[PDB]
Subunit: 264 residues, 2 copies
């Protein structure tokens, strides 16, 4: 997509050499923002083929609130295997905070239900927020949330969402981060009888790994194709009742897939 390739070029041009926790090198910038008008099309990167199978299962899994990887394994989704313990546990990552944020007084707060009802009853609200950044729970998490905090907004019948992503792997992660939250906005808008607005992406440490440079150069040589279209095949009774098969992408004509590694 235009904004995505512009980000990649910016990191190339302006990024500074910066290492990650393993010692693996990157080029990094701090602070960036992009906006995707969801009525223009579904913002799935076209300059390489991006598969959404794991991303859809992951989002349904987040929304279900159980952080054991059993559901992912039931569907042969393996993207959290690296972080899970022998029993398949991850600690109180994403879904536990979205659905059952623990409080000092022993309650567990369902932020997703909170937001859905704010959107339906008080759409002007300036505090329609979900946070995964539960400071007390960070140490028990397999890793701290990268997509940490998000806010919804309603105007002129349209639902928008802004994500704050503290750390972003531009090449491997970001295409998927965009698609995941764009899907969530479509699901929430359907459930609230709203049209889709903008997905606004905001980054903190936004980086290209040094061993993604060949891939980045190739991708920047390609012209974006028309955005595809998301089809939701059925309207479920709530935000918690979506199924994998409810989602189809039409009109997706990407350039070929581009593989990239990780260090250990």
């Amino acid at each position: 997509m235009k904004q995505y390739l512009e980000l990649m070029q910016k990191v190339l041009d302006e990024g500074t050499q910066k290492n990650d926790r393993t010692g693996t090198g990157t080029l990094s910038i701090f602070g960036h923002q992009m906006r995707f008008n969801l009525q223009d099309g579904f913002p799935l990167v076209t300059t390489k083929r991006c598969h959404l199978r794991s991303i859809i299962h992951e989002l349904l899994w987040f929304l279900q609130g159980d952080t054991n990887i059993a559901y992912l394994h039931e569907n042969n989704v393996t993207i959290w295997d690296e972080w899970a313990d022998e029993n398949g546990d991850l600690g109180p990552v994403f879904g536990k905070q979205w659905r059952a944020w623990p409080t000092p007084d022993g309650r567990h707060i369902d932020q997703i239900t909170t937001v859905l009802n704010q959107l339906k009853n008080d759409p002007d609200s300036r505090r329609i927020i979900v946070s995964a950044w539960n400071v007390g729970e960070l140490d028990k998490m397999a890793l701290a949330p990268c997509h940490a905090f998000f806010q919804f907004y309603v105007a002129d019948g349209k639902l928008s969402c802004q994500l704050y992503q503290r750390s972003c792997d531009v090449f491997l992660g970001l295409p998927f981060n965009i698609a995941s939250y764009a899907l969530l906005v479509h699901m929430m808008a359907q459930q609230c009888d709203l049209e889709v607005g903008d997905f606004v992406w905001t980054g903190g440490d936004t980086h290209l790994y040094s061993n993604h440079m060949d891939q980045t150069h190739l991708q920047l040589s390609r012209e974006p194709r028309p955005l595809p279209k998301l089809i939701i095949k059925r309207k479920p009774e709530s935000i918690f009742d979506y199924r994998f098969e409810d989602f189809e992408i039409e009109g997706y004509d990407p350039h070929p897939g581009i593989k990239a590694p990780v260090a250990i």
Copy 2:
């Protein structure tokens, strides 16, 4: 400042009519970002005179962690009086979360000490974060935090900070929000033997109140003046030992002050 006036003009041009919780009208946009290179000068709005007295006391008060307004009243700082109860209490707002975030297991987490030591020991970290958005504590707060979440970053000997502000009163609040966090970056950089980098400001619901329109039109007719310079007159032994008198602004030649109201 250029970026500030550009934001104001954007809200004028592109903002949509949107009411707040009291029913007071605004023009609103969702999602914006600005960057202030702190080596260029201290980013204090010059197109109207902005007083920093209350803002400096407020920041020292945040850093001290006690949310009773007694310290503010000791200095005749009245900007939190509206929200305080008969005993001067605000509930677990800002400073309580910065210095003593309560956890389910009964601990209280000092996020400011955490960050200072991350900056000194693990400056490459992508999770140097302070959050005020303690979901369990929102209901006891006098109001939910507007400046909700911030992240630090180090590269090339320079400390940067990004703020996520969920709700922003562009005319009355934003000049002060910018100055408060810019001061904090200077204080933290001094304590970590770092130079100052960028303050990156990110907004959610970013709005101009309808009864600030006369003022906005006047302000947009003025040309920004050179940025002033922050002087820290003494290096304290830690981030918790700063005093009001340690701070001076030099070279501040603003256009006259512009008064603006609020509804009740």
